[PDB]
Amino acid sequence: PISEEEKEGLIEMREEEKLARDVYLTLYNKWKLQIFKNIAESEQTHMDAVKYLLEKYNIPDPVKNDSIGVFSNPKFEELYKKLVEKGDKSEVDALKVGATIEDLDIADLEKWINKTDNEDIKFVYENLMKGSRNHMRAFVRMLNNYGSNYTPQYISKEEYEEIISSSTE
């Protein structure tokens, strides 16, 4: 059976995937870099994956309004606003924000992964995490094309180096 702590996790990650989807849709509409469109689609997939677990356990969905920018947990509302403002400044700032979101997601997925023994919850979280590593590699390579790079904020320097020095999974 699912624990209250495990429920709290799925609730947070349901909106964390939405944060990434929403920022990326917003930055695509701004800068029309295909990367944002492509990855926003992948985030929609991830949102769906978490929703399927929510439904499986009949947990109330925090997403009561699918509209871009709308969140139940204000942690994500504040992150949405701060990150779109940053990302509006330049193509490089928007790509840095992509890398930032993925950085936070990988750190948060690690957090929740380490609090559960449920194999169906782990498979989804591991798959989400593999996705976020792929996204991080894609955003950084793009920052490289602009003559830029990324400094990690949430995961360790060492984890960041392992991600970017390997090819996409």
Interface positions with its own copies (CB under 8 A)? 25-26, 29-30, 64-70, 84, 88
Q: Which is nearer to its own copies, 85 or 162 (CB)?
A: 85
CB 73 within 8 A of CB 122: no
Q: Which is nearer to Mn ion, 118 or 132 (CB)?
A: 132
Going from the C-alpha of 62 to that of each of 32, 39, 115, 126, 166, the distances in angstroms are 29, 22, 20, 22, 35
CB proximity list for 25: less than 8 A, separation 6 or greater: 36, 40, 68
- Partner from its own copies, Mn ion, none contacting 132, C-beta within 5 to 8 A by type: Mn ion
CA atoms within 13 A on the CB side of 120: 11
Q: Which is nearer to Mn ion, 46 or 137 (CB)?
A: 46
> Two tokens at 149?
């790079």
Q: How far is the CB of 64 from Mn ion (least distance, A)?
A: 20
Q: Considering only residues 49-78, where is the footprint of Mn ion by CB under 5 A?
A: none
9 residue type, one letter: G
- Partner from its own copies, Mn ion, none contacting 26, C-beta within 5 to 8 A by type: its own copies
| 46: contact with Mn ion by CB under 5 A | yes
Instruction: Give the binding site for Mn ion (CB under 5 A).
Output: 17, 20, 43, 46, 102, 132, 135
